[PDB]
Amino acid sequence: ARVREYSRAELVIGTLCRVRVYSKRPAAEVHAALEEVFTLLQQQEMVLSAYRDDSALAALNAQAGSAPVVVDRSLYALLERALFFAEKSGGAFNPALGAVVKLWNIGFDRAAVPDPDALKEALTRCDFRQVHLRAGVSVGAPHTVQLAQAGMQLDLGAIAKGFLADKIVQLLTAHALDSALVDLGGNIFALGLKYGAQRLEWNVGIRDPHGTGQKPALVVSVRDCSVVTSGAYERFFERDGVRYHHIIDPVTGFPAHTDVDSVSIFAPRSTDADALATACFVLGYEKSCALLREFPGVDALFIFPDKRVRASAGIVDRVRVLDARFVLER
C-alpha cells in the first residue's frame, strides 16, 4: 500500500477551512472522511453561530431570562468547558459577552465606536456566572441551559473553532486516519506525523502580527498538538486614527490594551488552546504566565511589539525563526 496526500478546503464558519491528510488507506475511505468533515462543519455552523438567526445558539439567546432550554450533549459539553475557562481566567475569557460584542460587531460594519452608556449597560448583561448548566443523572436525562440574567447573550466565537477542530480530529480518528493537518481559519490541529517514507513533525507557522499574512515569521515543529493564536491585528477597524480590534477586555468593554502583539497556545485539545489564547491576550504577559502554571500540559509563545519572542520550555527548542527581524529569547 502506498502513501497518498490529500487536501480539501471550503468556505464555511465564515472562514477558509482546510484539511490535509496523509494515508495508506484506500482513497475512497479518505474521500468519505473528508466528505464527513465538511458536512460536520456545515451542520455545526447552524448549531454554534452567533451571526445567524436560525442557529441553536441564537435560539438559546432568545430565551434569556426565561426557562431552561434542552441542548444536545455536545453543545452542553462545550458550554461547560467555556465556563471552566471563564472561571479560571477570572473572566478574561467570557463566553457570555454577546451583549457587548454585538455593539462592537455593528461598529465593525459601520466603522464607528459604540456609545459609552450603551457599553456600560451592555456590560451589566455579561455575567457568565448566571449561565446555569443542569443535567440529570438518570438514564436518557436531558441536558439543559438557562440564561438567568435578562438580555444576556452567549457568543462562542473565541472557543468554537477549537471545539470544531477537536471534533474533526475525533472524526478523522474514527475513520482510522492518524496523519492530518486541520486548519480552521488559522486554528490548527496537527494530528500525528506527516510524511517526507520518513515520518516528520508538522511545521506550524506563526505569522508576523503586522504582516500581510502570506508568510510565517516563525515555525514550530509539533505532533498531536493544537496551535491557536490570538492577536490584535487579526480583525479590526479604524476610526479617526485609532484601531479597534475584536478581542474585548470585559472589564473595560473596549478592545483589550495588552503588552503582547500575539499569543499562541499549544495544547492537546484545540478547545483549550482557543479559549486560553483569547484569555491570555486579554490578561497580558505576566498574568498569562501565572494562569498557564495552572495548565502544565500546555505551552505558549508570545510575540511582543518589539519583535522579541518568548516560548515556554516545552516548545522553545522546536521554534525556528524565519523572519530575522524577530528574536527568540532562550
Positions in the binding site for ligand FAD (CB under 6 A): 13-14, 45, 48-49, 51, 93-95, 97, 101, 155, 157-158, 160-161, 230, 234, 246-248, 250, 274, 278, 282
Which phi and psi (to 5°) does residue 101 adopt? -60, -45
264-293 residues in contact with Mg ion (CB under 5 A) are 274, 277-278
- The 231-270 site mask, x for binding Na ion (CB under 5 A), equals --------------------------xx------------
* Closest CA relative to residue 253, chosen from 90, 119, 52: 119
The answer to whether 205 and 221 are in contact (CB under 8 A) is: no
Residue 311 site contact among ligand FAD, Mg ion, Na ion, none (CB < 5 to 8 Å, cut-off depends on kind): none
Residue 276's SS3 state is: helix
By CB under 5 A, tell whether 262 contacts Mg ion: no
- The 170-209 site mask, x for binding Na ion (CB under 5 A), equals ----------------------------------------
Q: Measured from the CB atom, is 20 or 246 closer to Mg ion?
A: 246
155 appears as a binding residue in the annotation: yes
The Cα–Cα gap between 101 and 154 comes to 10
274 appears as a binding residue in the annotation: yes
End-to-end CA distance of the chain: 43
Let me know the angle formed at the C-alpha of 296 by 234 and 129, rounded to the nearest 5 degrees. 65
190 appears as a binding residue in the annotation: no
The answer to whether 91 and 175 are in contact (CB under 8 A) is: no
- The 142-171 site mask, x for binding Mg ion (CB under 5 A), equals ----------------x--x----------
The DSSP annotation for 253-305 comes to: TEE---S-SEEEEEESSHHHHHHHHHHHHHH-HHHHHHHHTT-TT-EEEEE-T
In whole angstroms, the minimum distance from the beta carbon of 211 to ligand FAD comes to 15
The answer to whether 219 and 205 are in contact (CB under 8 A) is: yes
248 appears as a binding residue in the annotation: yes
Whole-angstrom CA distances from 38 to 31, 144, 175, 177 are 11, 28, 14, 16
Parallel/antiparallel/unpaired status of strands 327-329 and 308-311 = parallel
In whole angstroms, the minimum distance from the beta carbon of 327 to Mg ion comes to 26
Grid cell listed for 259: 503588552
In whole angstroms, the minimum distance from the beta carbon of 104 to Na ion comes to 17
278 appears as a binding residue in the annotation: yes
- The 121-140 site mask, x for binding Na ion (CB under 5 A), equals x--x----------------
Show binding-site residues for FAD. 92-94, 155, 161, 246-248
Q: Which residues bind Na ion (CB under 5 A)?
A: 121, 124, 257-258
